[PDB]
Amino acid sequence: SNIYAPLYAPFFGFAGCAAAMVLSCLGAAIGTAKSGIGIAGIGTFKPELIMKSLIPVVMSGILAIYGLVVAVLIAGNLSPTEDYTLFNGFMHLSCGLCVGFACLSSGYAIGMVGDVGVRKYMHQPRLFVGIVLILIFSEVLGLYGMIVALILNTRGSE
Amino acid sequence: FYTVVGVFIVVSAMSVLFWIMAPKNNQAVWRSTVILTLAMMFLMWAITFLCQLHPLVAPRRSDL
Amino acid sequence: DILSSIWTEGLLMCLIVSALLLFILIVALSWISNLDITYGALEKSTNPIKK
Amino acid sequence: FQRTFVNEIRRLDNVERQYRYFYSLLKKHDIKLYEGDTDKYLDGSGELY
Amino acid sequence: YGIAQYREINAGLPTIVTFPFMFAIMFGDMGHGFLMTLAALSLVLNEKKINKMKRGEIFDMAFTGRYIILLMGVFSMYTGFLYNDIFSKTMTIFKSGWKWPDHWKKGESITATSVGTYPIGLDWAWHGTENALLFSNSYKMKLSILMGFIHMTYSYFFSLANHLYFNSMIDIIGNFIPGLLFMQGIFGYLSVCIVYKWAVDWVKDGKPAPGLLNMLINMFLSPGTIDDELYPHQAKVQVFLLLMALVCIPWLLLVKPLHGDIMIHQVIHTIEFCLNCVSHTASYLRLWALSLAHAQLSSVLWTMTIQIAFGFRGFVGVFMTVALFAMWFALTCAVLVLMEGTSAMLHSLRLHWVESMSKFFVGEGLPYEPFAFEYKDMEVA
Amino acid sequence: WCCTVLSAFGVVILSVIAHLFNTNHESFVGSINDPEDGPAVAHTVYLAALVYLVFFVFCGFQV
Amino acid sequence: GVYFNIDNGFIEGVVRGYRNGLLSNNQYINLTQCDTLEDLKLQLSSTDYGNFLSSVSSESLTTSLIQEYASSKLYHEFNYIRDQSSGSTRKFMDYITYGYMIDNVALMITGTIHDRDKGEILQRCHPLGWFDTLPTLSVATDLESLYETVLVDTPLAPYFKNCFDTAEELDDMNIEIIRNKLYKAYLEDFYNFVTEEIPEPAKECMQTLLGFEADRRSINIALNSLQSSDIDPDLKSDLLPNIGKLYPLATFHLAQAQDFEGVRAALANVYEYRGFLETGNLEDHFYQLEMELCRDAFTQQFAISTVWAWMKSKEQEVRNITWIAECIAQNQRERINNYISVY
Amino acid sequence: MTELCPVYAPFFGAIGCASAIIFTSLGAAYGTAKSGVGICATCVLRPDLLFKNIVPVIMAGIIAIYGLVVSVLVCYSLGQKQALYTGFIQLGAGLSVGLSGLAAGFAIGIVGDAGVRGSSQQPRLFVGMILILIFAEVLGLYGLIVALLLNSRATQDVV
Amino acid sequence: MTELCPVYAPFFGAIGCASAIIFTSLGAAYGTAKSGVGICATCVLRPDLLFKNIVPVIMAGIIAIYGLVVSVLVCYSLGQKQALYTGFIQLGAGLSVGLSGLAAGFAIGIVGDAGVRGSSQQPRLFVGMILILIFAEVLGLYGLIVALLLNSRATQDVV
Amino acid sequence: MTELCPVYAPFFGAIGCASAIIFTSLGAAYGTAKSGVGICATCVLRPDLLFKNIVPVIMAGIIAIYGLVVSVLVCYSLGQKQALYTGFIQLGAGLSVGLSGLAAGFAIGIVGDAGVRGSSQQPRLFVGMILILIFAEVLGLYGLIVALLLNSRATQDVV
Amino acid sequence: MTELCPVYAPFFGAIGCASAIIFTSLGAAYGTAKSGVGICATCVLRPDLLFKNIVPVIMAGIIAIYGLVVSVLVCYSLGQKQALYTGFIQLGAGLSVGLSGLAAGFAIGIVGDAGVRGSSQQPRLFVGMILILIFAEVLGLYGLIVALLLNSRATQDVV
Amino acid sequence: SFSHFLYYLVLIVVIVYGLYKLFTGHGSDINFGKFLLRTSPYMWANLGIALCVGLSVVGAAWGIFITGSSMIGAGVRAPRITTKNLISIIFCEVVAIYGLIIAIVFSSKLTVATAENMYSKSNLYTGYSLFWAGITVGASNLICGIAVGITGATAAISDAADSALFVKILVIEIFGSILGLLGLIVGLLMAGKASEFQ
Secondary structure, three states: OOOOOOOOHHHHHHHHHHHHHHHHHHHHHHHHHHHHHHHHHHHHHOHHHOOOOHHHHHHHHHHHHHHHHHHHHHHOOOOOOOOOOHHHHHHHHHHHHHHHHHHHHHHHHHHHHHHHHHHHOOOOHHHHHHHHHHHHHHHHHHHHHHHHHHHHHHHHHO | OHHHHHHHHHHHHHHHHHHHOOOOOOHHHHHHHHHHHHHHHHHHHHHHHHHHHOOOOOOEEOOO | OOEOOOEOHHHHHHHHHHHHHHHHHHHHHHHHOOOOOOHHHHOOOOOOOOO | OOOOOHHHHHHHHHHHHHHHHHHHHHHHOOOOOOHHHHHHHHHHHHHHO | OOOOOOOOOOOOHHHHHHHHHHHHHHHOOHHHHHHHHHHHHHHHHOHHHHHHOOOOOOHHHHHHOOOHHHHHHHHHHHHHHHOOOOOOOOOOOOOOOEEOOOOOOOOOOEEOEEOOOOOOOOOOOOOOOOOHHHHHHHHHHHHHHHHHHHHHHHHHHHHHHHHHHOOOHHHHHHHHHHHHHHHHHHHHHHHHHHHHHHHOOHHHHOOOOOOHHHHHHHHHHOOOOOOOOOOHHHHHHHHHHHHHHHHHHHHHHHHOOOOOOOHHHHHHHHHHHHHHHHHHHHHOHHHHHHHHHHHHHHHHHHHHHHHHHOOOOOHHHHHHHHHHHHHHHHHHHHHHHHHHHHHHHHHHHHHHHHHHHHHHOOOOOOOOOOOOOOOOOOOOO | OHHHHHHHHHHHHHHHHHHHHHHOOOOHHHOOOOOOOHHHHHHHHHHHHHHHHHHHHHHOOOO | OOOHHHHHHHHHHHHHHHHOOOOOHHHHHHHHHOOOHHHHHHHHHHOOOOHHHHOOOOOOOOHHHHHHHHHHHHHHHHHHHHHOOOOHHHHHHHHHHHHHHHHHHHHHHOOOOOOOOOHHHHHHOOHHHOOOOHHHHHHOOOHHHHHHHHHOOOOOHHHHHHOOOOOOOOOOOHHHHHHHHHHHHHHHHHHHHHHHHOOOOHHHHHHHHHHHHHHHHHHHHHHHHOOOOOOOHHHHHHHOOOOOOOOOHHHHHHHHOOOHHHHHHHHOOOOOOOOOOOOOOHHHHHHHHHHHHHHHHHHHOOOOHHHHHHHHHHHHHHHHHHHHHHHHHOOOOOOHHHOOOOO | OOOOOOOHHHHHHHHHHHHHHHHHHHHHHHHHHHHHHHHHHHHHHOHHHOOOOHHHHHHHHHHHHHHHHHHHHHHHOOOOOOOHHHHHHHHHHHHHHHHHHHHHHHHHHHHHHHHHHHHHHOHHHHHHHHHHHHHHHHHHHHHHHHHHHHHHHHOOOOO | OOOOOOOOHHHHHHHHHHHHHHHHHHHHHHHHHHHHHHHHHHHHHOHHHHHHHHHHHHHHHHHHHHHHHHHHHHHHOOOOOOOOHHHHHHHHHHHHHHHHHHHHHHHHHHHHHHHHHHHHHOOOHHHHHHHHHHHHHHHHHHHHHHHHHHHHHHHHHOO | OOOOOOOOHHHHHHHHHHHHHHHHHHHHHHHHHHHHHHHHHHHOOOHHHHOHHHHHHHHHHHHHHHHHHHHHHHHHOOOOOOOHHHHHHHHHHHHHHHHHHHHHHHHHHHHHHHHHHHHHHOHHHHHHHHHHHHHHHHHHHHHHHHHHHHHHHHHOOOO | OOOOOOOOHHHHHHHHHHHHHHHHHHHHHHHHHHHHHHHHHHOOOOHHHOOHHHHHHHHHHHHHHHHHHHHHHHHHHOOOOOOHHHHHHHHHHHHHHHHHHHHHHHHHHHHHHHHHHHHHHOHHHHHHHHHHHHHHHHHHHHHHHHHHHHHHHHOOOOO | OHHHHHHHHHHHHHHHHHHHHHOOOOHHHHHHHHHOOOOOHHHHHHHHHHHHHHHHHHHHHHHHHHHHHHHHHHHOOOHHHHHHOHHHHHHHHHHHHHHHHHHHHHHHHOOOOOOHHHHHHHHHHHHHHHHHHHHHHHHHHHHHHHHHHHHHHHHHHHHOOOHHHHHHHHHHHHHHHHHHHHHHHHHHHHHHHOOOOO
16 A cells, blocks of 8 residues: 555545434434324314424425435445545545435434424414425425535545 | 145145035134144144255254 | 553553443443332222222 | 114113212222122123024 | 235135244254143143133133144244254254264264255254354255245235236236335345256366355445356346346336325335345245254253253262253243244244235225124123 | 152153253253262262152042 | 323323223213212212222211312322333322422421421321422421421422522412412423423424413412512512413513503413403303313323323312312302313 | 454453443343333232333343343454454444443333333233333344344354 | 644644534524524514514524634635644634534524514514624634634634 | 563453452442432331332342452452463453443342332332342343353463 | 743744634623623614614624734734744733623623613613723723733743 | 533543643644554454444334334223234334344455555455445444334324224325435445455
8 A cells, every 4th residue: 555545545545434324314314203292183183284294294205305315426446456545435435424414404404494384384284385495494404514525525536 | 845735835835625525514713723723733844844854954962 | 553551452442342341331221210119009098989 | 963873872871870980989899799690691692503 | 913904715724834943043953842732732732621621811812823823833843853953952853964984083073075955854963063053054944944934925926816816917017016025136046056066066067166255245235246246148137137126116216106195104104015025035044043942951951951961970960861851841842832932933923924924915904793792601801 | 649740740851851961962962061970970960850759649649 | 192101101101091980971960969978978089080989987077078088189199190100101200299298398388487397288288299308308497407408308409509598488479479489480390391302293282281380370360469569560470470372462561560450461362261250250150161172182092191190180170079078068059060070 | 463353353352242232231230220110119009010110120130131142142252362343343242232231221211110000000010011022132132143243243253 | 844843733623614614503503593594483473573674584594694703714815835834823823713603603593582572472573683683794704803803813823 | 471461461350359249239229229219218218118129229239249350250260371362361351240230230220219118108019129129130130140151251362 | 842942832822812812802702792782672662872872882892893903912022933932922911801891892892772661661771871881991901901011021031 | 410520521631631732842642543444353343343333223123112102002902903003013023134234245255365565455444434334234224213103102092093094194104215225225335345354
């Protein structure tokens, strides 16, 4: 191995992959749990929202897909003899941390807003016209976080 | 590998014969249960024989 | 061969394993300290109604 | 409350209460309830004939 | 679980045969299965007395199962007639197809050689072998996978039959065919590959055996070209099957409505069907989980029994063994039979409701009532 | 009463073990790790079976 | 929050199931038409409460008997719900019980300042607020004896330590002041306990609802201010629980206010209570907002606050049952719909 | 003491064997206490279910039995000159067995408390209680499978 | 990989970009979550307020955008030749920008949780609430300005 | 200080004996604490029952005695020329015995408190409490057996 | 890189600038957040105090400007292969300025919350509260002077 | 707070140690410890397999306990909920399978070897891959388990009201299982990318 390629570079690559998997999954699970609690609470009073409350869990699934896409992209550079540089290794670690933690934050925000909206729509569902706007604004967090993560992954894979 | 095929033919013939030979009562129950249990027994045996025909690894021991 | 000062990886690995074991035992103790008894059902009451 | 046999239902309920009181007395005096063996035949009689 | 839909005849029949067999496939032991079959026979021959006797808190469920338990015992006895372990013991009724080298080393391990396969069940030489654990694991991987896919496909056939009883032409076209395409062109192809890797004698043919998991991974996220392949077309065939499975997703998504606001339910059902098929076929290895657990538990229990009983084979040793055998029987009976068996019946039934009936059960319905007199004459409380 | 079935099962198992030891199957005295005194194993298992049968007789009841 | 299942998941589930058996609005309307006592009993039997109507004879069957049966059902269900739980849920139930125990202890105070043959009080004490030392206080006659029986071996000791010097009560009405003083001490204890030992969202919900109850007590005190020669505004600020949503901007100003004009003007500083001081009725709108808050807390579905939500929601339901039974059995149809049935 | 067989690794095997038993016993005892609280609550409330509530206790004892079996299986394979691969395989088997045992232990304890409360409330709940109880101990069985396979493969070879 | 720039040099820059993205993202998530909770609470009582109350959510989005742009610039500036001085400078810039953005997002959420209530209570106090949130916007812009200055100084100095 | 037996070999044997004694004592003391609380609570109500309800204290004492016996058996295998492997094996045996003792102590204490309260409330649950106690103590027996096996492993042949 | 100026000196400079920006921004943001919460609570009842209520927000902005000025100076002093004294002095200036700014933000926010709460009840105590607000301003300027002195220390004669 | 005090003390001692080992020339000595290229690949593989198995078991048990408590609570009110909650239970064991399949794949995937450079490069790569593929799979399994448990409790609470609520709320559990399966797929892909050690 050359000086630019220590043997622990794919080590950091799997660090990034595992992080972008685990943290994103945790964020998605938190969002899904919040959405489920809100949906059950709304449905127990009036089932007119059993279909409407699918938006927050859809956003949580979108975050999970974000994390899985990040993991798949990160996994594309592993090899027993990849001659993989520490630059790219620690860069993949940073990308994985970025994807996972941004997904976690977006999932928390979206799940909290979804629970709030599910409780609010028990009174005036119409408020969904703004609840969906808040949900979209929250999901933009994870969206651009994944965009930046992909940009940094491409830079590391250069 | 043809032993599995021959056992399949024999089992299918026996199952067909016993399905045709339905008792005086609970004909559907008898036929279905006999056919299905014979089929499950044959899949069990056929999987065993198909595994044991060509082993990918031999056993090792230190008590012989 | 040695790392840092006097340290060796042969003890570093066992220290890490013991750290995870201590984490597991700490979690076990945390769930242990949460034990409680439903004294309302496990003990009698002096209320003349709904005793 | 609009059942056709509502009054008959009430009479049957009173009879059931009386039977429950009889069972309570039998338990209070440890009666053997020998008709329990006969009740099995009645269930068998009902199921068969 | 619920109440079936209306039509004609009577339904839920295949469970009657499958549940004992799937419980057996994880129960394993010939001796344990024979013992529980004997217990079921004892509880079944006295049905008149059983009806006469009190139902009991738990025995009522058991008494109602006086015939389910018997079938479970028969199936377990057959599986043990395959799994060469009476109680972790290969009796070797047939001729063992394996042979170690002519002069086994005085205290050094060796690797045996075989000239043929066992007539039925695991080869009689696999007792205490170091390889035995790995070989049995690689065995019941494909065993559980194939049995589970067979169960899923048969239940699916039931599903087709239930659709065919009704007209539901749009329903059939939008639900039956594409789901069959998914599960066949992916998991049935995997099962076919598992069969093939056993069909081809890679030792004699010399071609390296491709990894079944490796083949699945290559099919999932690559155009194929694994380190080895079942056949030159089999790589292309797997690629085509994966392409068809991928193309079948829009068939689930949009072919069903054919006319809608209710299509959201159809899309949810399609996603659930795909995910459930994947998850359940992955799950069926839980039958292996239970089977290996039972085998290892039996081996450990017998090891404890042998250590307690044999000792030095003296008069005091015989005295100790007299109680050791009874203690082993009591421990085996209680833990293994009373628990392991009830749990394993629950596991097989759970797999049933999770996969088999989930394939064909159409939903709730109206349960019939006989309106006959109870004839209780008891329980005045 | 209840212990009679246990004693009978123990007697049967010990008799089977003694038969295997006398035949010196691959298991039991067949294994090198296990003691190879096959006749001793058969004797011990036979005496254990006799004890179990005695327990069966003792537990036997008529009414 | 996910930990809540580990300690009170079963309790939460069974409490929610108990909530699901509330008064159906259509069922309540049908019962309201059945103004006859026997007809109302039959309708209530058709309600999820069960066969309680047939427990007693139709001769004594009245609105008082209906409320007695409802109270018995409340007491038994609450006893089961606290007995099946332990830990934080156990303490929460204990506190809930102390809420009524303040009033029961106040009733036990009656008979000490003036001899009153405490047997009737003991037979009539509210069951949900049962106190272990209640018979001990019953035997005690002197003010100091009852105080010791209440400050020792009775859990309400901190409240009687924060106030009630020697418990003379020679110029302080029990229900008007002493009951309100212990009620305020209880309210403060509840608020700080919720803030320091209850997780969110139940923490915020409990804070809001306890503020609502404290505001209700303050409003009642302000309404009662103009009809008393005692209860100076210096004491009124002491009379207030010194906690809640209106505190301090509206609570302090109301306490300083003495004329009726201050009363209503003070509630206008807070947006939530606007109009209650200027339209409708105090108690009716209090119960309306309390039922709304109980429904809101029950919407969370995974919080300790759900127990309090079901408590107060079906307390409002029992109040509605009293209203309907009285107005139907004794024939006052004009305000039969004054009952709240939005649950 | 070598590149592929240091003296630390046989400690790794011994410590894994000890820790499997330790954690499994901890989880099993926690589950036993949690189930026993409900059992004592129901038995005083309604004695006819005293025997019924003993089933989760027996199952917690079974979890402890699984843990002890894994511990003994690993311990009997211990040695002074065992390989480094053997050492980490044994520690992993022990840790996984202990973690799974403890997890199933407190899960079964919580489920048993809930089931005992339901049975005291209503005896018809046993049908779901037993389902939940198995549904919990299947995880313990999974841990058993993992531990058994790891321990069996641990002694495959040595250098 | 010289003495002034080892092989592990760009790790600092990558970690700095990650921190700049993540701390700002978490701050924006908290702020937007609090703003959305406030909106779903007050707007039910007065839907006429939600249209205005959407604004601080957009302000939190801009707070997120600061960190987004900073992280994108940092990732673009990465390398492996002079990534030691530049890498450490990027790490510091990312840490500073992320901390400032997280603080600004928390501030925006805390302000909005009361601003929505005030606006629902009074359409005149909405102007004051927006003015208050303008200071949080200024803080976020300050953080981005510091990040940009450090990023510019990062690469032009190293050898 | 041999290759497999450094100077610190008796260290882990002594530490294992200390743990097997101390942790088992702590668990037994917690169990005795719960049992004593329950007994003192019940005696004020049904002294003729509480006086016989001292069984859980006996169970805790049995757990403590088992721990002490494990420690004593460990003490025989200790030595300075004794190898480092058997020292770690003693350490692991002590750790397992102590953890099992803690588990059994908590389980037995909770079960005994609940059982004595039930017996005071209803005498029908005495047998059930005894059975729960025995099932809990089965875990302590499991731990003792595992510790004995590990100690015998340490006492076996070593370098 | 040498003893008087190793490779990581600009790393210390960047970290110091980052701390100076980040800590002061966090303090200012927290102060502005809770002061704005107080303003949104109070001015809703009284628009007459709404406009004057922005003074603590002005203080929060002043603290933020303090921190950004300090960070700008520190990072301007930063450069390649600089003396390790420069990096150390940058780190110290960052720590001192940021901690002082966070303290000033906390004090200003608390004082402003109390002041607005009082003023909504009595508008003539706002001018009095401006005294303690200016006290917090004095604290912030004190921190700024500390930062300036440390930055002057960094830019002196060094190698 | 004892835990907070311990955290602060650990942070302080770590910072101080780094301080007087980096202000001196021994700073590169920490880097070699940070390099940690000599760690045993067998250790990493075994630790990863065990961690995946244990984390999956913990998550499955947590979800199962939560769902079982909810089901036992609802069954007192309606036995239909008691029968229905076995769906959420089965979702929990689906997460358990997600874990156990990865564990078995790891167990069969490993090997034993001693070739020097093959060891150092390929075996270490595969050990790292096994360790953190198992870590990721176990963490995803735990997340799926907790989400499924919470959703199952909510679904049982809803089923106490109406079967329509149960059918609708099953979607949330469907998405939870989807997340769990996605995590399992990611772990399987990471395992496949790995090598057979040296």
